[PDB]
């Protein structure tokens, strides 16, 4: 029961908070296994769908925080993806394969800053170099600051950019509401009816994580965990990994 998730976004964008929020467990970053971006790999055991879930969250430190964010800066991201393909390919070729540690990355969440305008050249360059190796899932981070109209206009601009760069998002065999406008909070707050809920409290209101009227969080949760986790792993295995191995020979 393994699952490997990649989180690419600038520091402070909300990657850690969304991981704790999705899997409802604060120990996502309790176990760190060991100008360039650093790669941080976290291994946690999650009680999701009754069974133990061997979740592996791969995180980035310092993405987009150099004066020059060219490919050499964020190349450790791709080197790690290709390496997890390489490890599986070698272990798959051995006589005794039976409990392969499948470290292949099954989904790549790309965190978009809630600018409300457009994707930056760095956003397009990285996603242009990841969509053929991972299941790419773009999200609008901290989307609570955006009005209802800004989210629609922002999504429309973002999709036209990905389409014009021939960037291929993950399509559930949900796809139209991409990129997902998500919020993150595994913390309990009290709303204007006095009820204990997850979310964030402000002078101007209380936003609720598990509220479909406030975000797309449940859409991302369904896509990642509760509905389409199997097809995410399938596309990695049957297509993304096979295309990598073929062009390697």
């Amino acid at each position: 029961p393994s699952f490997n998730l990649l989180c690419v976004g600038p520091d402070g964008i909300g990657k850690t908070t969304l991981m704790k929020t999705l899997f409802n467990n604060d120990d996502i970053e309790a176990n760190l296994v060991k100008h360039k971006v650093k790669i941080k790999s976290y291994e946690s055991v999650i009680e999701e769908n009754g069974v133990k879930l061997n979740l592996n969250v791969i995180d980035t430190e310092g993405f987009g925080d150099f004066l020059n964010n060219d490919q050499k800066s964020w190349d450790p991201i791709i080197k790690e993806i290709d390496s997890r393909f390489d490890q599986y390919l070698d272990a798959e070729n051995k006589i005794n394969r039976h409990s392969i540690n499948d470290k292949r990355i099954h989904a790549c969440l790309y965190f978009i800053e809630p600018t409300g305008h457009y994707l930056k050249p760095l956003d397009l360059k990285f996603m242009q170099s990841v969509y053929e190796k991972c299941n790419l899932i773009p999200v609008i981070a901290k989307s609570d600051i955006l009005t209802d109209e800004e989210i629609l206009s922002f999504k429309k601009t973002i999709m036209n950019q990905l389409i014009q760069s021939n960037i291929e998002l993950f399509k559930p065999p949900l796809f139209s509401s991409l990129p997902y406008a998500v919020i993150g909070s595994n913390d309990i707050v009290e709303n204007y009816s006095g009820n204990q809920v997850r979310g964030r409290s402000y002078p101007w209101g209380v936003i609720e994580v598990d509220n479909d009227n406030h975000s797309d969080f449940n859409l991302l949760k369904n896509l990642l965990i509760k509905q389409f986790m199997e097809e995410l792993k399938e596309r990695t295995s049957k297509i993304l990994y096979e295309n990598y191995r073929s062009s390697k020979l």
Binding site: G12, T115, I207
Partner: protein
């Protein structure tokens, strides 16, 4: 009764027919509410977003460019000629190692232009003052320490102009995240020892230094901007309304916009203009003359 206390009336009447120049610059990455904040401070739609929703609008040279617009506002009898300077392309490119160099060039160019007139044998009585009087530096509300780009940009801009830090889109933060972030950035300012406006002058009184202390305690301002009026229970005010929130921009219990407006415009507006003269322009002029 002689009547020389009338002299302040004679001066005000002379300056009212003259007008007043204010040159303000906004620095920050696109999408931080910079054009919205300028349009909210002056209660008028002065500028559009320097890039908008079109990424093809970014400077083709792949560097920061100056976008200067000029405006005029009237209140009763005071006319205010406003120059707004946006910086499209700052921090928006893959390589931002020279993101601040066109900004530093523009600031020095205005001093150079002014000094070129002060040295002529036949000076004009009213030199056009295009010197940058204030810089609103927009920081992202991400709770992180100053990035390399912010350190490099601020370490130069804070030495040539009155830099006013501002947390753009500060409604991202809860009040506790606001306290922790503002306290972190202030410690960053102490760590790098930046000269952050306002300055303390010996000409200031004990009450003026106290005003400087209180305003300084909430810098960078946690601003929220909006040109659009919203309605909440019949009451109409300008702000933002969403599926879960309703922000009143002019509510001091929600953000620091009102404090920023009193500061930038109602108490330190003339101080900003004059400090550009006797501090920044004089410092520039002194270095040109010695060489």
């Amino acid at each position: 009764y002689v009547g020389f206390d009338t002299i302040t009336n004679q001066i005000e009447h002379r300056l009212l027919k003259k007008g007043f120049q204010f040159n303000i610059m906004v620095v920050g990455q696109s999408g931080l509410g910079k054009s919205t904040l300028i349009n909210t401070l002056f209660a008028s739609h002065l500028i559009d977003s320097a890039t908008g929703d079109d990424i093809s609008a970014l400077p083709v040279t792949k560097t920061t460019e100056m976008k200067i617009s000029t405006h005029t506002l009237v209140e009763d009898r005071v006319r205010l000629n406003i120059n707004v300077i946006d910086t499209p392309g700052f921090g928006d490119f893959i390589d931002n190692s020279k993101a601040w160099e066109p900004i530093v060039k523009y600031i020095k160019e205005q001093h150079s232009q002014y000094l070129r007139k002060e040295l002529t044998a036949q000076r004009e009585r009213f030199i056009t003052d295009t010197r940058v009087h204030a810089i609103l530096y927009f920081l992202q509300p991400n709770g992180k320490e100053l990035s390399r780009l912010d350190v490099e940009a601020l370490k130069r801009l804070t030495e040539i102009a009155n830099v006013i830090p501002v947390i753009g889109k500060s409604d991202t933060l809860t009040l506790d995240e606001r306290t922790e972030f503002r306290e972190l950035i202030q410690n960053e300012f102490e760590k790098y020892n930046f000269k952050i406006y306002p300055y303390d002058s010996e000409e200031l009184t004990d009450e003026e230094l106290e005003l400087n202390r209180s305003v300084r305690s909430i810098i960078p301002f946690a601003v929220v901007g909006s040109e659009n009026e919203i309605e909440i229970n019949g009451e109409t005010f300008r702000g933002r309304k969403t599926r879960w929130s309703a922000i009143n921009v002019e509510d001091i219990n929600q953000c620091d916009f009102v404090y920023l407006r009193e500061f930038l415009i109602r108490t330190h507006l003339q101080d900003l203009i004059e400090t550009t003269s006797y501090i920044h322009y004089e410092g520039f002029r002194a270095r040109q003359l010695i060489a």
